[PDB]
Symmetry: D2
Subunit: 245 residues, 4 copies
């Protein structure tokens, strides 16, 4: 509808403005602060009645996803700007300012990168798939550290990447550069924009066991749709690390 | 040395020409073959007396026409052409070209290291807890218990993170310019690493076996760091607890 | 403020239309770009009026059509806002070189979201200028050739790019020191005029009296050579005198 | 192969010098670019001779191999950061242009050509335009430093062709103008007062791209005269005729 394109227009300009701020600093906490201020000013000026995640309309903003990467100048970081409408992701913009890759999606309006259409891959077999995952800040505090999962899928697939940016990982599923992505311990601002981007690109986003996505649990399974069942089953069957030599 | 700069000039043009071929195909086996043919024609036309290693002369070129083949097949943006020269079995000239991001890494003994013809240098990080590392996993990983998983988990617990890009040559280039602090992998081949090794050394880094004894490429194992973290990372890899201990 | 909101939407319209131009890269391209721009401006500002009333948008969906037809890399989308007939918001986007020029009254001038400023050149000798030639040049003796020859003699050179909007953008970021042209249209210049003024430049008629876009004549400089260039334009020998 | 070896080295010299120009982006930049080009060419081809404006004549100028080097074509543009400047590296074999590389480091456009090996920009083939009518053509020209001292200043030609075509551009770089004919962005180019290092690389590039380069009257090119007519080949006779029939400015 007309509002969603208007929402997507403003989120795009906010992401590009913030991305330029992040690029300027390259010559970390200050950069993240400066990007957030730019994003908030734009969204609040155009949509004073909307809320920022913390009411029908709720913006989930990550001003700098991939903070560890950015501190090391590792080229995998982005701005993520997502809109929840009645708690459902409906508008998403993810901008990688180092590679100048602008991912945009909105419900019923399609998914693009640099304003050209993108689509998920068709891969259905784990043995022919390339996946990506991440590891949470709390990984030393719980036995559920995602290592078992990583090892298991690394054995069953062509490989599991680790980029260091959850938002970019979702964008890479959306354009078919990987076939699937899973992670625990993520935050709403890490994933809201990527979820609608991926769904518009033809993918599927659920919990690990293929029951509906519950962002509050911090767990996400996001695939091209064709590999969703095989990946869900492999994750639920995961042998513990103690079962390896 | 005049000699090394001339070798570096030709390896640079070979990498750029092959990178353009890889870009043309993006619009996998054919791409790899076409890239190799381009590299071989250039090296052998300029240096007909040199020997080629790909797929005991004084001059031996270790060529990877497409490092990151899995990534390339998926269009995952981490692949490159790697062109390294072994002089009496020692890496001395290296060019690594990422044609998707247009990043040209160049180094030669005594001549320095550059990315896009501008100097690069390794990071200063000395503590594992403040470090960002990268590693990979071999094609034989299902057949041996030494699959590198224990190392990956251990280091992921001890550092800020361990990346997995899918290109060993780009991983070495990322150590060389300070985007990661260290890199280790088993099951690699000479053409994966020769260019990156001399690039990293010229950038100020250090490349050895896991236990810090001299690098032995034939074993397929490499530890490549900024030099300041080399000792701590080497000790962490040697003390690695097995997966069964988790 | 209001101007920032206008600038935000003009920027997204220029980038959206520019991507359309890149996809085609002539009549179809120009029309597709215009439809993209018009849809965006009307959806965000249903009460504004269009040029292609307090708010009046002057849109060129493809400035430099001859260049575009030849794939000569000097064409752009130009989106300017007149508020009570005064240029106040301007976006010029070169999609081939991916150069985004943005300006609004009191908000500054940027290229690719970085500040730009006019040059410091103060002497007509040592200056680099640019000009253009109108479609009607064969029907009138005042075809701008005499001016081109005169200024080419008095300066380091007079460029001819083929895009009036980009010429103004080039003055705004200091790549040239001044620009003059006759036979231009409002949609060619509205965005560039405010961009240049925000960058520190000056825009008038040839004789330095206030700009009159309806006359089709513009003199646009870094401000420091403005009087010198204006004097030269007031003292142009006819072609017959060569 | 023989020419391919020359082209490989000229390409690396152009890219290395272009990176120096991008770092600086004037007197030093021009000189720093030349030092990079000369070092590469003389190290790979120590027996070849060099022609350049600043360094002058290096080795016997009747050598079979003579490199015509412009380390920074478009110096006025460069001083103003006007984005139309390049490194031009051409090789004359027995006085004939046979290898050419032109590199615009600001836009990162690498033009390459050699006799029998084809013409490319950024390593993909380029070709001249199909434009056959002067009235439908886009041209480009330039004006020499001596224009105030001679009545033959090219103004009459500029006015005449501006009337007969869709327009005449003025970019400020003769080497890039030749490269623009080579890839079809313009249909033709003419200029007086040019130097060998301005045109040698572009001449072979344009010829390999399918174009044609002569004197104004379509007799063979004589670079020593400083005049060049360079087109897509299809408007060559029409543009030559217009150049032979230029009304003086006084007739306007």
């Amino acid at each position: 509808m007309t509002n969603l394109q208007t929402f997507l227009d403003i989120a795009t300009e906010a992401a590009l403005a913030a991305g330029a701020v992040l690029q300027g600093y390259l010559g970390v906490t200050a950069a993240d602060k400066a990007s957030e201020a730019v994003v908030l000013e734009i969204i609040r000026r155009h949509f004073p009645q909307h809320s920022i995640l913390a009411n029908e309309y709720l913006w989930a903003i990550d001003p700098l996803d991939g903070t560890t990467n950015y501190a090391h100048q590792y080229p995998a970081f982005c701005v993520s700007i997502g809109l929840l409408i009645n708690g459902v992701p409906q508008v998403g913009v993810i901008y990688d300012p180092f590679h100048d890759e602008l991912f945009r999606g909105a419900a019923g309006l399609g998914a693009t990168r640099n304003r050209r259409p993108i689509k998920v891959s068709d891969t259905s077999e784990l043995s022919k798939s390339l996946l990506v995952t991440g590891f949470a800040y709390d990984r030393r505090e719980t036995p559920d550290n995602n290592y078992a999962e990583f090892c298991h899928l690394t054995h069953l697939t062509q490989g599991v990447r680790r980029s260091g940016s959850a938002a970019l990982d979702l964008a890479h599923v959306a354009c078919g550069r990987v076939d699937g992505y899973w992670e625990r311990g993520i935050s709403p601002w890490d994933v809201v924009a990527g979820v609608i981007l991926l769904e518009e690109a033809g993918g599927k986003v659920t919990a690990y066991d293929s029951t509906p996505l519950k962002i509050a649990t911090g767990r996400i399974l996001a695939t091209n749709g064709s590999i969703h069942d095989n990946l869900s089953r492999a994750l639920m069957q995961v042998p513990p690390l103690s079962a390896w030599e």
